[PDB]
Structures are given as structure tokens and as C-alpha cells.
Amino acid sequence: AVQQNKPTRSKRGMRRSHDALTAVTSLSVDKTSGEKHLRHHITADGYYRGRKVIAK
């Protein structure tokens, strides 16, 4: 239920090989307000696909 050796720190790098994060690829620039937001998400000012959708 437990190791018999100390696993080398070279293994620990190899175990963390897939643990890298992932940057957000595309940021939709809003065509009206000009501010950048997540594609298919609303802006930080209540715009979505040009038009104002929610007065925050």
C-alpha cells in the first residue's frame, strides 16, 4: 500500500508532464464596445454579439 523506494525527482517531472495548464485561445473582441471577452460569453459590461443585453 506504499512505495518501497523513493521515486526519483526525474519521475516526478514525468508524472507532471500532463499537468500543464492551457491558455485561452480565442478572445472575442466585441464589435460594439470594443472590449475583449470570452467567445460565446457576455462581456464585462453586458454586451453580447454587439448589442447590450444586460444593464449590470
Binding site: 470570452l38 460565446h40 460569453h41 457576455i42 453580447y48 443585453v53 444586460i54
Partner: protein, 119 residues
């Protein structure tokens, strides 16, 4: 496995799920737009949009059904007196989902849900 199934479990038992959407749908209509998580928002559509479907026919029976779905007289009023004639010519699709990014405290995907003709 869950082949061809429907509904969500939402990490809640069934009496809590039904009681939560009852409290939520009434809280929607009282404000016409609320902020909630995305899987709760995608599931609320399968409650409120039949209530608005029921809102298109002001019988005394549908008064008694919609009160049995919500248990709130004010919501029963606002459905038939206002939302009835408001959405009176829409073939479904009475609400809209707008995603406002993620929640601060627990990284939950929040989304606004609103009615279509709120503006």
C-alpha cells in the same frame, strides 16, 4: 449508463430538485432575469417554458394547475395577466441564456437567464 435519458440530478435528491425549481421559477418571474449556474439554468428552461405555455390560456383550471406548480398567488397572477398576453404569439422559446463567466468563490460557471421580451 444513461442512454436516451433526460433530466439532471444536480447532486440533489428528487424532492429537493422539485422544490428548488419551484422556488426558482417563482423567483424568475418576480424579476424576469436572474443569475445562476449554467446547468441549473439549462434545466430551468424545462420548467418555466411550460408554465409560460400554460400562461396562454386563462381558464380556472390552468389557474389551479399553475398554482399547483408554484404555490404562489402573485406568480399565478403575473403569469396569466401579463406573461399570457406578452408571449402570446411565440412558438416556445420564451427565455434566453447568457453566460457571464465563472463564479469567484468556487469557479462555478454562472449564467444569466432572462425572459425574451423583458426589454
Amino acid at each position: 449508463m444513461r442512454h436516451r435519458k433526460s433530466g439532471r440530478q444536480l447532486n440533489r435528491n428528487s424532492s429537493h430538485r422539485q422544490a428548488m425549481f419551484r422556488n426558482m421559477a417563482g423567483s424568475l418571474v418576480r424579476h424576469e432575469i436572474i443569475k445562476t449556474t449554467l446547468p441549473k439554468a439549462k434545466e430551468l428552461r424545462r420548467v418555466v417554458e411550460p408554465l409560460i405555455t400554460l400562461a396562454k390560456t386563462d381558464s380556472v383550471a390552468n389557474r389551479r394547475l399553475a398554482f399547483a406548480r408554484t404555490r404562489d398567488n402573485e406568480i399565478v397572477a403575473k403569469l396569466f395577466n401579463e406573461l399570457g398576453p406578452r408571449f402570446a404569439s411565440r412558438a416556445g422559446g420564451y427565455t434566453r441564456i447568457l453566460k457571464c463567466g465563472f463564479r469567484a468563490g468556487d469557479n462555478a460557471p454562472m449564467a444569466y437567464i432572462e425572459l425574451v421580451d423583458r426589454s
